[PDB]
Design a protein around this ligand. Structure first.
Ligand SMILES: CC[C@]1(O)Cc2cc3c(c(O)c2[C@@H](O[C@H]2C[C@H](N(C)C)[C@H](O)[C@H](C)O2)C1)C(=O)c1c(O)cccc1C3=O
Length: 297
Protein backbone atom coordinates (compact mmCIF):
# COMPACT_ATOMS: atom_id res chain seq x y z
CA UNK A 1 0.00 0.00 0.00
CA UNK A 2 1.00 3.64 -0.17
CA UNK A 3 0.41 6.74 1.93
CA UNK A 4 1.39 10.38 2.25
CA UNK A 5 2.75 11.14 5.71
CA UNK A 6 3.21 14.57 7.32
CA UNK A 7 6.64 15.81 8.38
CA UNK A 8 6.54 19.41 9.59
CA UNK A 9 6.07 21.62 6.54
CA UNK A 10 6.57 18.80 3.98
CA UNK A 11 4.52 15.77 2.94
CA UNK A 12 6.34 12.51 2.17
CA UNK A 13 5.18 9.75 -0.16
CA UNK A 14 5.80 6.19 1.09
CA UNK A 15 4.92 2.60 0.26
CA UNK A 16 5.51 -0.84 1.72
CA UNK A 17 6.17 -4.51 1.10
CA UNK A 18 5.45 -7.62 3.14
CA UNK A 19 3.22 -8.30 6.11
CA UNK A 20 2.50 -5.21 8.25
CA UNK A 21 2.81 -7.47 11.34
CA UNK A 22 6.45 -8.35 10.64
CA UNK A 23 9.24 -6.21 12.15
CA UNK A 24 9.63 -2.86 10.42
CA UNK A 25 12.57 -2.25 8.09
CA UNK A 26 12.95 1.35 6.84
CA UNK A 27 14.93 1.87 3.64
CA UNK A 28 16.68 5.25 3.32
CA UNK A 29 17.85 6.06 -0.21
CA UNK A 30 20.84 8.09 -1.36
CA UNK A 31 20.90 11.69 -2.49
CA UNK A 32 18.45 12.89 -5.14
CA UNK A 33 16.93 9.40 -5.23
CA UNK A 34 13.24 8.65 -4.68
CA UNK A 35 11.77 5.47 -3.19
CA UNK A 36 12.20 3.86 -6.62
CA UNK A 37 15.97 3.99 -6.12
CA UNK A 38 15.26 0.82 -4.13
CA UNK A 39 14.18 -1.64 -6.83
CA UNK A 40 10.77 -3.20 -6.07
CA UNK A 41 12.35 -6.63 -6.52
CA UNK A 42 14.99 -5.91 -3.88
CA UNK A 43 12.43 -4.62 -1.36
CA UNK A 44 10.39 -7.79 -2.01
CA UNK A 45 13.36 -10.08 -1.46
CA UNK A 46 14.00 -8.41 1.87
CA UNK A 47 10.34 -8.42 2.93
CA UNK A 48 9.94 -12.10 2.00
CA UNK A 49 12.52 -12.94 4.68
CA UNK A 50 10.03 -11.81 7.35
CA UNK A 51 10.17 -7.99 7.35
CA UNK A 52 7.71 -5.16 6.84
CA UNK A 53 9.75 -3.07 4.41
CA UNK A 54 8.90 0.62 4.11
CA UNK A 55 10.52 3.00 1.64
CA UNK A 56 9.80 6.62 0.84
CA UNK A 57 10.63 9.69 -1.23
CA UNK A 58 13.00 12.19 0.38
CA UNK A 59 11.69 15.72 0.16
CA UNK A 60 12.53 17.06 -3.31
CA UNK A 61 12.26 13.59 -4.90
CA UNK A 62 9.41 11.51 -6.30
CA UNK A 63 5.99 12.54 -5.02
CA UNK A 64 7.17 14.34 -1.85
CA UNK A 65 7.10 18.12 -1.37
CA UNK A 66 9.40 19.68 -3.93
CA UNK A 67 10.43 23.28 -3.42
CA UNK A 68 13.03 25.91 -4.32
CA UNK A 69 15.89 25.02 -1.93
CA UNK A 70 17.28 28.57 -1.86
CA UNK A 71 13.98 29.91 -0.46
CA UNK A 72 13.53 27.07 2.07
CA UNK A 73 16.93 25.58 3.03
CA UNK A 74 17.33 22.38 5.02
CA UNK A 75 20.02 19.93 6.11
CA UNK A 76 20.61 16.40 7.36
CA UNK A 77 18.71 17.15 10.57
CA UNK A 78 15.58 17.60 8.48
CA UNK A 79 16.36 14.54 6.34
CA UNK A 80 16.78 12.40 9.47
CA UNK A 81 13.65 13.77 11.14
CA UNK A 82 11.74 13.07 7.90
CA UNK A 83 12.80 9.41 8.07
CA UNK A 84 11.46 9.27 11.65
CA UNK A 85 8.25 10.99 10.45
CA UNK A 86 7.79 8.10 8.03
CA UNK A 87 7.98 5.70 11.00
CA UNK A 88 5.40 7.88 12.81
CA UNK A 89 3.21 7.79 9.70
CA UNK A 90 3.18 3.97 9.71
CA UNK A 91 2.75 3.71 13.50
CA UNK A 92 6.20 2.15 13.96
CA UNK A 93 7.94 2.72 17.31
CA UNK A 94 11.32 1.15 16.45
CA UNK A 95 12.60 0.03 13.05
CA UNK A 96 15.56 -1.72 11.48
CA UNK A 97 16.92 1.19 9.44
CA UNK A 98 19.04 0.72 6.30
CA UNK A 99 20.90 3.75 4.90
CA UNK A 100 22.53 3.73 1.47
CA UNK A 101 25.14 6.14 0.10
CA UNK A 102 24.22 9.68 1.28
CA UNK A 103 21.46 7.82 3.13
CA UNK A 104 24.10 6.27 5.40
CA UNK A 105 24.97 9.84 6.47
CA UNK A 106 21.27 10.46 7.16
CA UNK A 107 21.12 7.24 9.23
CA UNK A 108 24.16 8.25 11.32
CA UNK A 109 22.20 11.39 12.23
CA UNK A 110 19.15 9.23 13.05
CA UNK A 111 21.42 7.13 15.30
CA UNK A 112 22.64 10.25 17.14
CA UNK A 113 19.41 12.23 17.49
CA UNK A 114 16.61 9.63 17.21
CA UNK A 115 18.35 6.57 18.70
CA UNK A 116 15.14 5.65 20.59
CA UNK A 117 13.48 4.85 17.23
CA UNK A 118 15.99 2.16 16.17
CA UNK A 119 15.89 -1.63 16.43
CA UNK A 120 19.12 -1.79 14.42
CA UNK A 121 21.22 0.14 11.92
CA UNK A 122 22.59 -0.95 8.56
CA UNK A 123 24.74 1.27 6.35
CA UNK A 124 26.17 0.58 2.90
CA UNK A 125 27.89 2.53 0.11
CA UNK A 126 28.81 5.36 2.47
CA UNK A 127 31.20 6.49 5.16
CA UNK A 128 31.64 8.22 8.48
CA UNK A 129 30.48 11.67 9.56
CA UNK A 130 34.15 12.63 9.94
CA UNK A 131 34.67 12.22 6.17
CA UNK A 132 34.56 15.68 4.55
CA UNK A 133 33.06 14.22 1.38
CA UNK A 134 32.28 17.36 -0.65
CA UNK A 135 35.71 18.76 0.15
CA UNK A 136 37.24 15.45 -0.88
CA UNK A 137 35.61 15.58 -4.33
CA UNK A 138 37.32 18.95 -4.78
CA UNK A 139 40.61 17.53 -3.47
CA UNK A 140 40.65 14.44 -5.71
CA UNK A 141 40.02 16.60 -8.80
CA UNK A 142 43.03 18.76 -7.85
CA UNK A 143 45.22 15.79 -6.90
CA UNK A 144 45.35 16.71 -3.19
CA UNK A 145 45.13 14.08 -0.44
CA UNK A 146 42.04 13.77 1.73
CA UNK A 147 42.59 15.10 5.25
CA UNK A 148 41.10 11.88 6.68
CA UNK A 149 43.70 9.73 4.87
CA UNK A 150 41.13 7.34 3.38
CA UNK A 151 40.55 7.04 -0.38
CA UNK A 152 38.50 9.76 -2.04
CA UNK A 153 36.04 9.11 -4.86
CA UNK A 154 37.64 7.32 -7.81
CA UNK A 155 37.56 7.75 -11.58
CA UNK A 156 34.21 5.98 -12.19
CA UNK A 157 32.57 8.55 -9.90
CA UNK A 158 34.05 11.41 -11.95
CA UNK A 159 33.00 9.62 -15.16
CA UNK A 160 29.42 9.32 -13.87
CA UNK A 161 29.35 13.06 -13.10
CA UNK A 162 30.58 13.78 -16.65
CA UNK A 163 27.79 11.65 -18.15
CA UNK A 164 25.25 13.39 -15.91
CA UNK A 165 26.34 16.70 -17.55
CA UNK A 166 25.57 15.42 -21.12
CA UNK A 167 22.12 16.30 -22.54
CA UNK A 168 19.38 13.73 -23.12
CA UNK A 169 16.32 14.66 -25.18
CA UNK A 170 13.21 12.57 -24.54
CA UNK A 171 12.29 9.65 -22.29
CA UNK A 172 14.15 6.90 -24.15
CA UNK A 173 17.37 8.94 -24.11
CA UNK A 174 16.94 9.85 -20.44
CA UNK A 175 16.47 6.20 -19.44
CA UNK A 176 19.50 5.13 -21.50
CA UNK A 177 21.59 7.92 -19.95
CA UNK A 178 20.61 6.93 -16.41
CA UNK A 179 21.32 3.25 -17.11
CA UNK A 180 24.75 4.20 -18.51
CA UNK A 181 25.46 6.06 -15.23
CA UNK A 182 24.54 3.03 -13.11
CA UNK A 183 26.62 0.75 -15.33
CA UNK A 184 29.68 2.96 -14.73
CA UNK A 185 29.08 3.07 -10.96
CA UNK A 186 28.30 -0.65 -10.64
CA UNK A 187 31.49 -1.69 -12.44
CA UNK A 188 32.15 -5.19 -13.79
CA UNK A 189 32.76 -7.15 -10.57
CA UNK A 190 29.19 -8.45 -10.51
CA UNK A 191 26.78 -8.99 -13.44
CA UNK A 192 24.99 -5.81 -14.60
CA UNK A 193 21.82 -6.11 -16.67
CA UNK A 194 20.88 -3.02 -18.65
CA UNK A 195 17.30 -4.12 -19.32
CA UNK A 196 16.48 -4.51 -15.62
CA UNK A 197 18.00 -1.12 -14.74
CA UNK A 198 16.11 0.46 -17.65
CA UNK A 199 12.85 -0.92 -16.25
CA UNK A 200 13.75 0.39 -12.78
CA UNK A 201 14.37 3.89 -14.21
CA UNK A 202 11.16 3.74 -16.25
CA UNK A 203 9.32 3.07 -12.97
CA UNK A 204 11.20 5.93 -11.25
CA UNK A 205 10.24 8.34 -14.04
CA UNK A 206 6.60 7.16 -13.97
CA UNK A 207 6.64 7.64 -10.21
CA UNK A 208 7.75 11.25 -10.75
CA UNK A 209 4.74 11.90 -13.01
CA UNK A 210 6.74 11.16 -16.16
CA UNK A 211 9.09 14.08 -15.49
CA UNK A 212 12.52 13.40 -17.02
CA UNK A 213 14.75 15.71 -14.95
CA UNK A 214 16.49 14.05 -11.98
CA UNK A 215 16.08 15.68 -8.56
CA UNK A 216 18.84 18.18 -7.77
CA UNK A 217 17.99 19.86 -4.44
CA UNK A 218 20.35 17.65 -2.44
CA UNK A 219 23.40 19.12 -4.23
CA UNK A 220 22.74 22.22 -2.09
CA UNK A 221 23.04 20.36 1.23
CA UNK A 222 25.79 20.93 3.76
CA UNK A 223 27.15 17.91 5.65
CA UNK A 224 27.10 17.67 9.43
CA UNK A 225 30.37 18.95 10.94
CA UNK A 226 33.00 16.24 11.57
CA UNK A 227 32.65 16.80 15.35
CA UNK A 228 29.53 14.61 15.24
CA UNK A 229 31.55 11.47 14.41
CA UNK A 230 32.77 11.29 18.03
CA UNK A 231 29.16 11.13 19.27
CA UNK A 232 28.69 7.77 17.50
CA UNK A 233 30.64 6.12 20.36
CA UNK A 234 27.36 6.37 22.37
CA UNK A 235 25.35 4.27 19.86
CA UNK A 236 24.16 0.91 21.29
CA UNK A 237 21.80 -0.61 18.71
CA UNK A 238 23.25 -3.45 16.62
CA UNK A 239 25.01 -1.94 13.63
CA UNK A 240 25.98 -3.53 10.33
CA UNK A 241 28.27 -1.78 7.87
CA UNK A 242 28.41 -3.27 4.36
CA UNK A 243 31.36 -2.45 2.10
CA UNK A 244 30.84 -2.96 -1.62
CA UNK A 245 34.24 -4.42 -2.55
CA UNK A 246 34.71 -2.18 -5.60
CA UNK A 247 32.78 0.92 -4.49
CA UNK A 248 34.11 3.81 -6.62
CA UNK A 249 32.60 6.54 -4.38
CA UNK A 250 33.41 5.23 -0.87
CA UNK A 251 36.20 2.70 -1.42
CA UNK A 252 37.54 0.35 1.23
CA UNK A 253 38.43 0.92 3.97
CA UNK A 254 35.61 3.48 4.37
CA UNK A 255 33.51 0.72 5.72
CA UNK A 256 35.84 -0.48 8.17
CA UNK A 257 36.39 3.08 9.34
CA UNK A 258 32.64 3.72 9.74
CA UNK A 259 32.31 0.48 11.72
CA UNK A 260 35.18 1.65 13.94
CA UNK A 261 33.14 4.71 15.00
CA UNK A 262 30.30 2.65 16.53
CA UNK A 263 30.99 0.15 19.36
CA UNK A 264 28.20 -2.22 18.21
CA UNK A 265 29.22 -2.26 14.54
CA UNK A 266 30.16 -5.33 12.54
CA UNK A 267 31.57 -5.21 9.01
CA UNK A 268 30.54 -7.28 5.99
CA UNK A 269 31.84 -7.05 2.42
CA UNK A 270 29.95 -7.97 -0.76
CA UNK A 271 32.52 -9.35 -3.22
CA UNK A 272 32.63 -7.66 -6.63
CA UNK A 273 29.94 -5.09 -5.85
CA UNK A 274 30.05 -1.45 -6.97
CA UNK A 275 27.88 1.61 -6.20
CA UNK A 276 24.61 0.25 -7.59
CA UNK A 277 21.98 -2.42 -6.96
CA UNK A 278 21.91 -4.87 -9.88
CA UNK A 279 19.80 -7.96 -9.09
CA UNK A 280 23.02 -10.03 -8.98
CA UNK A 281 23.63 -8.62 -5.47
CA UNK A 282 20.02 -8.61 -4.16
CA UNK A 283 20.34 -12.11 -2.69
CA UNK A 284 23.68 -11.51 -0.93
CA UNK A 285 22.53 -8.10 0.39
CA UNK A 286 19.18 -9.47 1.63
CA UNK A 287 20.94 -12.41 3.30
CA UNK A 288 23.32 -10.31 5.38
CA UNK A 289 20.66 -7.74 6.29
CA UNK A 290 18.20 -10.46 7.32
CA UNK A 291 20.81 -12.23 9.47
CA UNK A 292 21.54 -8.89 11.14
CA UNK A 293 17.93 -7.89 11.83
CA UNK A 294 17.24 -11.40 13.18
CA UNK A 295 20.05 -11.04 15.74
CA UNK A 296 18.68 -7.64 16.84
CA UNK A 297 15.34 -9.21 17.89
C1 LIG B 1 26.79 11.83 -7.34
C2 LIG B 1 26.64 10.57 -6.50
C3 LIG B 1 26.79 10.80 -5.00
O1 LIG B 1 28.01 11.48 -4.69
C4 LIG B 1 26.46 9.57 -4.16
C5 LIG B 1 26.90 10.02 -2.77
C6 LIG B 1 27.85 9.27 -2.06
C7 LIG B 1 28.35 9.70 -0.82
C8 LIG B 1 27.82 11.00 -0.31
C9 LIG B 1 26.89 11.71 -1.04
O2 LIG B 1 26.46 12.85 -0.51
C10 LIG B 1 26.42 11.22 -2.27
C11 LIG B 1 25.50 12.02 -3.11
O3 LIG B 1 26.18 13.28 -3.17
C12 LIG B 1 25.51 14.43 -3.73
C13 LIG B 1 25.37 15.49 -2.64
C14 LIG B 1 26.77 15.89 -2.19
N1 LIG B 1 26.58 16.75 -1.01
C15 LIG B 1 26.01 17.89 -1.08
C16 LIG B 1 26.93 16.30 0.12
C17 LIG B 1 27.49 16.54 -3.38
O4 LIG B 1 26.80 17.68 -3.87
C18 LIG B 1 27.59 15.48 -4.48
C19 LIG B 1 28.27 16.01 -5.74
O5 LIG B 1 26.29 14.96 -4.82
C20 LIG B 1 25.57 11.66 -4.60
C21 LIG B 1 28.31 11.49 1.00
O6 LIG B 1 27.84 12.53 1.51
C22 LIG B 1 29.32 10.68 1.72
C23 LIG B 1 29.79 11.13 2.94
O7 LIG B 1 29.35 12.29 3.44
C24 LIG B 1 30.73 10.39 3.65
C25 LIG B 1 31.19 9.19 3.13
C26 LIG B 1 30.71 8.72 1.90
C27 LIG B 1 29.76 9.47 1.18
C28 LIG B 1 29.29 8.99 -0.06
O8 LIG B 1 29.73 7.90 -0.49
Amino acid sequence: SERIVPSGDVELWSDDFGDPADPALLLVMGGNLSALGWPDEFARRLADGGLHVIRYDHRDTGRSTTRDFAAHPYGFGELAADAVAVLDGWGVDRAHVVGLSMGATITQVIALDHHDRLSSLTMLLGGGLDIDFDANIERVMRGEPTLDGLPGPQQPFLDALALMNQPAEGRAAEVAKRVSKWRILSGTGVPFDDAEYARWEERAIDHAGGVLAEPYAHYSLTLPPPSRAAELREVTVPTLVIQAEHDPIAPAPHGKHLAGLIPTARLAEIPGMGHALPSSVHGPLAEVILAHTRSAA
